[PDB]
From a paper:
In the present work, we present the purification and biochemical characterization of a mJRL from the stem of Ananas comosus (AcmJRL). Size-exclusion chromatography clearly showed that AcmJRL is a homodimeric lectin in solution. AcmJRL adopt the expected β-prism fold with the three characteristic Greek key four-stranded β-sheets (β1–2 + β11–12, β3–6 and β7–10) and all the connecting loops well defined in the electron density. The structure of AcmJRL is the second structure of a mJRL reported with two carbohydrate-binding sites per monomer after BanLec.
This structure belongs to the P212121 space group and is characterized by Rwork and Rfree of 14.6% and 18.3% respectively. Two densities were identified and attributed to citrate molecules. The strongest interactions are between monomers A and B, and C and D; they mostly involve strands β1 and β10 with an average buried surface of 826 Å2 and ΔG of −11.5 kcal/mol as calculated by PISA. On the other hand the A-C and B-D interactions have an average buried surface of 695 Å2 and ΔG of about −6.2 kcal/mol.
Numbering used by the authors:
A (entry chain D), B (entry chain B), C (entry chain A), D (entry chain C): 2 to 145
């Protein structure tokens, strides 16, 4: 609502998960990953209060936490999608680039790349499809 | 700008004072008032960092602090513009209404009224024209 | 939507009437008026097609049409609300100000003034409350 | 800007070319292509007036015109970037997908792919870097 919504990158399996709020700021990402992306969880701010979205996806893999500093925000996201074992098409890797540093890559960068550089705007939330892994991924952006 | 900008209410004396960037949350207002509005100062959040705008205007009158709680936000602003002494058109009064309570009125409700009820959106910042008193006033809003 | 929605100015009688489209351009206003505002109708554009909203209100008074030229857009709206005979609070007058000329005032400028100068943004649609007359009025804005 | 601006895909050579203001509707694309993308030109609407952006880029290749019907809009863009001749990273191919049909691919789909599926929003304009070819490419999006 007032946000541009990009997606989906990835396949059709899993179950859709999406936000119900009105995010103004992305404060933290928790990503689980191994040979692909296992799960996503993120916190966002609405009317001065923090909300937790997720966890979406399974408890496999290893956990990594991205917690943005004051004045730090994402300027790009990259990743790859493709098959893993019996799953036809899922999210194999993700990389998050802020104005201060790069986080990742998480997962293995097999399959078809995608990339979202942001020239004017802010990334404030995510959605996707999830089962035991991240089947598909999308992004919410606010104009700057 | 990604923000809708309303204004100006008032005259054309004084310094045009404005913010840069794209505030996403208004946290605090400090207002000085007596027979008119003397000064405005407000804190806002951008990219997780708090900034202080102002003080804009002089040190006349009496000071009042409005501090918004998490989950509290403005739903309307009212005011009046008119003459005071030798200044033909400045800001005589302001009232701030949140979802929780009403703050004010501040100043004296003499002159021409104005009113900005918000049915969908968030007030995140202000601008105006300022000398010894508040000569003109405006509002920044983002979609909700 | 990604629109800021301002309102309501006026009273609580009549029926709320609104849009749910995705307007990107206000093309035309048809207004009926006499001692107050009798009715409102407007057209907007979405994906290069024109859509008619309204008519909201009664068939009294006389009709005027405001059709904007290419390159012409509203920079302000003014009006007044107040009693008309036995009605406590309805829309008594409206004035539409574009970057090229002023349309109105329509009705009689009795009652409490309101005014919406737009410093950055575009007015793309309206809503309100309506019976035989225009009981209340509001405005949709997109950022510029 | 009230528009989300994505980019740049491609390299750092050539000269930046961009629009001003806030387009609200994309009406036409003319693209020149052969081994890569040679040039881009597009028509857009702002405040009810149609403007021409470009042509940006060179005179080589062959020309194709995409004329959007009323009710037709882009739902996705895909492309590829990579080296060619004296240029280390430029735009090798572009594909434009509307709600009615697919236009392209133009150029040669050699190099690193990118893809922008729009789940909620409208593509209204483009920008990039240009010399005799299209060195880099970006996209303006409006909330829907």
């Amino acid at each position: 609502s007032g946000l541009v919504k990009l997606g989906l990158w990835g396949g059709n399996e899993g179950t859709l998960q999406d936000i119900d709020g009105h995010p103004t700021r992305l404060t933290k990402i928790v990503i689980r990953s191994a040979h692909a992306i296992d799960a996503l969880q993120f916190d966002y701010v609405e009317d001065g209060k923090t909300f937790a979205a997720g966890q979406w996806g399974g408890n496999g893999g290893k956990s990594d936490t991205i917690e943005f500093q004051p004045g730090e925000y994402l300027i790009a996201i990259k990743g790859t999608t493709g098959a893993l074992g019996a799953v036809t098409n899922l999210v194999r890797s993700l990389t998050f680039i802020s104005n201060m540093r790069t986080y990742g890559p998480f997962g293995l960068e097999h399959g078809t790349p995608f990339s979202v550089p942001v020239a004017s705007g802010r990334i404030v939330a995510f959605y996707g499809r999830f089962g035991s892994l991240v089947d598909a991924f999308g992004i919410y952006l606010m104009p700057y």
